[PDB]
Each structure stands twice: as structure tokens, then as C-alpha cells.
Design a protein around this ligand. Structure first.
Ligand SMILES: [Hg+2]
Ligand SMILES: [Hg+2]
Ligand SMILES: [Hg+2]
Length: 204
């Protein structure tokens, strides 16, 4: 918001509710620290970096975004703000990505819900889907049971289709009680630790 000590910038509603849930099980207390999670409702982070950057309010902030590329241009647009005057057109995607981590901007190589399904939350996500979609046809229920039994053969199209039908935010809120420290995606842990460190250092 505007009375925050820090901001975690996020693409949509799923991260808006999953990120605080992972913060709690990492013992990083976002509310007590005065850190708010803000959805930019898409992939354009530039207005928010302008608001929170050195020429705006100068508020510690981090970014969580998906590789998809077109992430190179997306990050060049925020690097032009937070590292102004410097040219970045010469850099390739990987150099832009590793430069961006210095400013707390982190890229995920695998979209959030499929990563969680594969990365240890398969049976919890199946339980939410069937609570929220209680009249799934038999073929879809069998496909979903097949992804649980073998989380490397997920039909990603159908999984995301089911989650979007439930509502990405509603799904994330229903899943949030199930997350644990050991299934936290690396890019979320990196961003949470980065903003925590920045706020704690100001106390130091
Ligand atoms: Hg905000
Ligand atoms: Hg904001
Ligand atoms: Hg917000």
C-alpha cells in the first residue's frame, strides 16, 4: 500500500495468497514486519517500481514473476528504472535475470500451480479441486488421479483450466493451509528472504 515498510510485487491472485502462506511457515512475519503483498494484475511491473523506486517513495520491494522470454524485456523495463542511466540492451536473457536478482527481482522457471502439484502438494490440490468442482466428469477425475499417482505426467492445460474455473485466488486461499516449509519454491523463498533482510537491516 503506502504505509508499508516493504512491498512484495506479484503477478496475480494466486501468488497474493500463496506467498503469505509460505512466509508464515518460513517464520517470516509479513504483517508484523509491515510488508504487504501487491498484485500488479498481469506482467507490467514498471509503474510499481517507479512508485517504489529511488525517484518515487524509495520503499524496499521485491518482484516475483514467471519466465514464460518475454521476461527479458519485462526486467529491462524495471532495471531501467531502478538502475537508471545504465544501458541493458546489450545483455541476453540470462544476464538480465542474474543482474535483476541483485535488486530482489526473481524469476520462476515453472508456473506456480504446476510446480506445486509436482513439487509435493499433488494430493492437497486434488482435494481442493474436487471440493470446489464436485461434479467433475469421470474422465477428468481419472485424469486427475493419474496426475496424483505420477506428478510428472500432468496435463498442464487441464489443470490450469480447472483452477481458473474455480478462481485462481479462491483456489490459492483453499490451498494455503496445506503449504509447508519443504515445498516452498526457491524463487518465493529468495524473494521473502530478500525483503526480510532489507527491512531487518534498516533496524540494524
Ligand atoms: Hg501495494
Ligand atoms: Hg504498491
Ligand atoms: Hg496491495
Amino acid at each position: 500500500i503506502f504505509f508499508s515498510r516493504g512491498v512484495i510485487l506479484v503477478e496475480g491472485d494466486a501468488e497474493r495468497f500463496i506467498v503469505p502462506a509460505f512466509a508464515e511457515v518460513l517464520n517470516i512475519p509479513l504483517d508484523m514486519l509491515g510488508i504487504t503483498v501487491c498484485s500488479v494484475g498481469g506482467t507490467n511491473f514498471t509503474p510499481y517500481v517507479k512508485l517504489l523506486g529511488p525517484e518515487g517513495l524509495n520503499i524496499p520491494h521485491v518482484i516475483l514473476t514467471d519466465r514464460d522470454p518475454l521476461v527479458r524485456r519485462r526486467l529491462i523495463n524495471v532495471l531501467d528504472v531502478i538502475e537508471g542511466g545504465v544501458d541493458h540492451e546489450e545483455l541476453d536473457a540470462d544476464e538480465v535475470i542474474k543482474l535483476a536478482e541483485q535488486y530482489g527481482y526473481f524469476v520462476n522457471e515453472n508456473t506456480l500451480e504446476p510446480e506445486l502439484f509436482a513439487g509435493g502438494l499433488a494430493e492437497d490440490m486434488q482435494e481442493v479441486i474436487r471440493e470446489e468442482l464436485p461434479r467433475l466428469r469421470r474422465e477428468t477425475l481419472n485424469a486427475l488421479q493419474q496426475w496424483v499417482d505420477d506428478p510428472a505426467q500432468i496435463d498442464e492445460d487441464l489443470l490450469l483450466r480447472l483452477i481458473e474455473r474455480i478462481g485462481k485466488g479462491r483456489f490459492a486461499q483453499a490451498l494455503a493451509p496445506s503449504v509447508s516449509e519443504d515445498v516452498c519454491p526457491a524463487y518465493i523463498r529468495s524473494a521473502l528472504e530478500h525483503i526480510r533482510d532489507a527491512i531487518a537491516l534498516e533496524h540494524h
